[PDB]
Coordinates of C-alpha atoms in Angstrom, one line a residue:
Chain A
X1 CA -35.1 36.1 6.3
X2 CA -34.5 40.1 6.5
X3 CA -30.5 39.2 5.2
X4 CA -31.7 37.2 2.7
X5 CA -28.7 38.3 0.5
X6 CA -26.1 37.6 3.2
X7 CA -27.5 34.1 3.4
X8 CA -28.1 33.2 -0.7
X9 CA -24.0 34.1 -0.8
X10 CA -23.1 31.8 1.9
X11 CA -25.7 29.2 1.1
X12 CA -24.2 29.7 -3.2
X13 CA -20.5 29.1 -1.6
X14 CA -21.5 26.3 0.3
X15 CA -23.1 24.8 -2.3
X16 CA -20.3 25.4 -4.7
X17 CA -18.0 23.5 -1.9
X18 CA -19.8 20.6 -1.4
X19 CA -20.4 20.1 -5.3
X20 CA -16.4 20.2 -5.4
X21 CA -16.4 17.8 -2.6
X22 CA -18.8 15.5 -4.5
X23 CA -17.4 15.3 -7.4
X24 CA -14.1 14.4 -5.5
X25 CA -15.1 11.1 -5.2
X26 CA -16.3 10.4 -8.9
X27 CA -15.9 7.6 -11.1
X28 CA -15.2 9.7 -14.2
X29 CA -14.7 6.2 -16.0
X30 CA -12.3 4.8 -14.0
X31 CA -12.8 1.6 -12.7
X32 CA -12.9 2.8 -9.0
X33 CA -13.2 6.6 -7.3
X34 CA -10.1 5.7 -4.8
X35 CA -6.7 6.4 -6.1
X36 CA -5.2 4.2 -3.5
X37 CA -7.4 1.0 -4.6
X38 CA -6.3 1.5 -8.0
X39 CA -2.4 1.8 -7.3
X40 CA -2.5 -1.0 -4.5
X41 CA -4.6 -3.2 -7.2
X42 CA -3.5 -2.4 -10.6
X43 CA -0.6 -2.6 -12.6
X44 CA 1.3 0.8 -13.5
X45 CA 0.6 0.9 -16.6
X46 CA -3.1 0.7 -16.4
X47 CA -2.9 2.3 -13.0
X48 CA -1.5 5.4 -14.5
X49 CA -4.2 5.2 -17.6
Chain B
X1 CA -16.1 -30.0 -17.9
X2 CA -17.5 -29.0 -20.4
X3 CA -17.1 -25.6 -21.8
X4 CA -21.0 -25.2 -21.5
X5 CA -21.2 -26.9 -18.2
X6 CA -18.2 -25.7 -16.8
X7 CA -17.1 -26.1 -13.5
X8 CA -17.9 -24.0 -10.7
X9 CA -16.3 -24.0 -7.4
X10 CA -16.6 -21.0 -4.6
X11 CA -13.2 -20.0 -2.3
X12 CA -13.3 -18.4 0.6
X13 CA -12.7 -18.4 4.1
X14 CA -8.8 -19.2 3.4
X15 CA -5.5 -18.0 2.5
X16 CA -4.8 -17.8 -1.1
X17 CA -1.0 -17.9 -2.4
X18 CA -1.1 -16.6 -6.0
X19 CA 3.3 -16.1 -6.1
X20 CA 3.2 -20.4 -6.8
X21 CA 1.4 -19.9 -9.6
X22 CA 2.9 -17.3 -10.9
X23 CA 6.4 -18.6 -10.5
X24 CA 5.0 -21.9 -11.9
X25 CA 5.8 -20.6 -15.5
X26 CA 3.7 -23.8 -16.5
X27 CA 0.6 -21.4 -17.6
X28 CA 0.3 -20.9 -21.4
X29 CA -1.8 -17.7 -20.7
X30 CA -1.8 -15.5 -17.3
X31 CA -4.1 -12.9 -18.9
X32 CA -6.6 -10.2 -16.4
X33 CA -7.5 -6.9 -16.1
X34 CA -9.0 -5.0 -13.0
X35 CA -6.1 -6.3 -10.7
X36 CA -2.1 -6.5 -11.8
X37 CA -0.9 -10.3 -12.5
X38 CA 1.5 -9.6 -9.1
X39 CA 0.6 -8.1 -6.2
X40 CA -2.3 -10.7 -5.3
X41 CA -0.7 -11.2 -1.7
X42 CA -1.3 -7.9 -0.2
X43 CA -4.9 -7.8 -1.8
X44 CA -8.1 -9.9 -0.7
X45 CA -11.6 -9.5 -1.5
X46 CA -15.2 -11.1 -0.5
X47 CA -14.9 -14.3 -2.2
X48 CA -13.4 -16.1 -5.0
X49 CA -15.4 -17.7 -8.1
X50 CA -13.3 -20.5 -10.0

């Protein structure tokens, strides 16, 4: 732990990345995470709502 | 049956042809959300609840 700075900026990135990653796959009040269910289940209307 | 006893039958383990009863145009009211009134023949799921 002598580079601790080194390591807090990559670990802060990292972090930051796989949040963003995460919240790729979020409901956000949709009625499913997956783009493809939706447009291979719903009509276009409410698929593009 | 009754409205308060109604009917319950479970479907699964089969093919299920939705485009007859679509095309039937004997329906009153075709009315659901959460999938599209078409495009029931390329989609299948766990079960079905009647």
């Amino acid at each position: 732990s002598a580079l601790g700075k080194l390591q807090d900026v990559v670990n802060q990135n990292a972090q930051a990345l796989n949040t963003l990653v995460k919240q790729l796959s979020s409901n956000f009040g949709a009625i499913s995470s997956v783009l493809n269910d939706i447009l291979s289940r719903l009509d276009p209307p409410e698929a593009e709502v | 049956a009754s409205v308060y006893a109604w009917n319950r039958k479970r479907i699964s383990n089969c093919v299920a042809d939705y485009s007859v009863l679509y095309n039937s145009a004997s329906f009153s009211t075709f009315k659901c959300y959460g999938v599209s009134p078409t495009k029931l023949n390329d989609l299948c799921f766990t079960n079905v609840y009647a």
